[PDB]
Amino acid sequence: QTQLRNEMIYSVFVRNYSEAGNFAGVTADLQRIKDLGTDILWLLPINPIGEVNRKGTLGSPYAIKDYRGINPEYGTLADFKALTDRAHELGMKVMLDIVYNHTSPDSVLATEHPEWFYHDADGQLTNKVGDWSDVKDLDYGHHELWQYQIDTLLYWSQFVDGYRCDVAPLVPLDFWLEARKQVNAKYPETLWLAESAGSGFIEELRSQGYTGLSDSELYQAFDMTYDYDVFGDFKDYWQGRSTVERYVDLLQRQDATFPGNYVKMRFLENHDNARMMSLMHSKAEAVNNLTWIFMQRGIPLIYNGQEFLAEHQPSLFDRDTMVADRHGDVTPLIQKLVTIKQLPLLRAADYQLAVVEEGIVKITYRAAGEALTAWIPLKGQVTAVATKLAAGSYQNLLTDGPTEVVDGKLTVDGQPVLIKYV
């Protein structure tokens, strides 16, 4: 499980990735995705989308009409298979998005097994979340639903290597445990990422009697969860409504909240969120903040287009092709972070965070008589920082440039300093 801490996920929204917006558009470009340093290629949902109560023109990929079908938007089963075959040829794993809280109202399950759904007073299908007018909730109270859900997985597991589970906290833990048991029995290497919730949403769900799993509950069934417990706290810090001391204190608390082997997916943006390059506006800022998501304990997410400094959050509902939304290129930076992220020290049990000079964040991993320290000036701070290193020249792993330690002090010039030492 801690091997994932040497890895990186790249997330692709097929509809919008290329002009054509099909699998082929992705398949044609898998070498670039591989070369970026991608270990796991996670695709947004690839199944046919509901027509009834559709939101916008194409609808959200999260409103699924058939869990076992291919969205004709993307092409055919053979086209999907060409993508996965190519990804595997290049050594990547493919992860699919699993949307198991709900289906579109016109879905196969809703027409053939309407009894597996929640029904309100009129006997109408229903959605616990107001905004989600395009989908209706499944009732995992009906244990026969389970086997269909899981059989869908064993089917896709012929092609893919793992699953990202959409709003996983809304679906009962006992279902996830069985799902994983059956799937990893046939496919033992299978990876499981949960889209965990913030405390706000968990509380709202629980207070209305709905299922709302904690992140630690999810870890009983999942290898990874999302940083949604603290992402809000990052934004507040970033936007000047929280201090670095409060943010780092929350991550210190976070680190002892989960089992020692836990893996959080650390991110600056994703499909559901504003772009990194809407939070910040310069390549200097991107270097600091990408270094931060790579150097924290866990596994970083790169959302398609983030490597080209995209500014626009693609719509989920209408065509919103992201090809012209490129404003630079931090590929070399990401590749270089990937080479550092591969180091065994990144799996080390001894991980410490501290707030140092001018509110710089200092990360340290220690294991087996070696250490890696990253000084990350999230805010572009320029200052000397204290170190117990002997005087002399060290290699900043980020730049491969020399870094002078003089009288127990080293210069951080508004960009990260990464030093591996004995």
Query: Which residue pairs from 355-362 have beta carbons closer than 8 angstroms and sit at least 24 positions apart in sequence?
Result: 355/244, 355/245, 355/248, 356/385, 356/386, 357/381, 357/383, 357/384, 357/385, 357/386, 357/412, 358/383, 359/243, 359/244, 359/245, 360/385, 360/412, 361/244, 361/248, 361/292
Pairing of strands 9-12, 40-43: parallel
**Structure resolution, Å:** 2.0
Q: Take residue 250 and report the two structure tokens written for it.
A: 């929350």
* Domain stop point among 313, 329, 347: 347
Q: Are residues 290 and 364 in the same domain?
A: no
Distance CA 100, CA 221 (A): 15
Q: Are residues 366 and 326 in the same domain?
A: no
Method: X-ray
Distance CA 31, CA 33 (A): 5
Q: Are residues 318 and 353 in the same domain?
A: no
Q: Are residues 74 and 202 in the same domain?
A: yes
End-to-end Cα separation, the chain, in angstroms: 26
Q: Tell the burial category of 7 from Cβ atoms under 10 Å away from its Cβ (0-12, 13-18, 19+).
A: buried
Instruction: Provide the domain count of the chain.
Output: 2
- The candidate with the shortest Cα–Cα distance to 290, out of 312, 313, 269, 273, is 269
Furthest-apart CA atoms within the chain: distance in Å: 76
Distance CA 210, CA 47 (A): 27
Distance CA 86, CA 28 (A): 9
* Domain stop point among 301, 324, 347: 347
What does each C-alpha distance from 147 to 80, 143, 176 come to in angstroms?
24, 8, 12
Q: Tell me if 176 sits within 8 A of 157, measured CB to CB.
A: no
Q: Are residues 361 and 326 in the same domain?
A: no
Distance CA 12, CA 141 (A): 33
Q: Are residues 284 and 356 in the same domain?
A: no
Q: Are residues 363 and 335 in the same domain?
A: no
Q: What is the CATH number of the domain that holds 62?
A: 3.20.20.80
Q: Are residues 42 and 158 in the same domain?
A: yes
Q: Are residues 262 and 340 in the same domain?
A: yes
- Tell me which amino acid residue 364 is: T
Q: Are residues 287 and 412 in the same domain?
A: no
DSSP string, 32-57: HHHHHT-SEEEEPP-S-B-STT--TT
Please report how the helices 173-186 and 143-156 are oriented relative to each other, as an axis angle in degrees rounded to 10.
40
Domain that holds residue 39: 1-347
* Domain stop point among 298, 322, 347: 347
Q: Are residues 311 and 377 in the same domain?
A: no
Tell me, letter by letter, the H, E, C secondary structure of 69-117. Answer: CCCHHHCCHHHHHHHHHHHHHCCCEEEEEECCCEECCCCHHHHHCHHHE
Q: Are residues 97 and 210 in the same domain?
A: yes
Q: How far is CA 159 from the centre of its chain?
A: 21
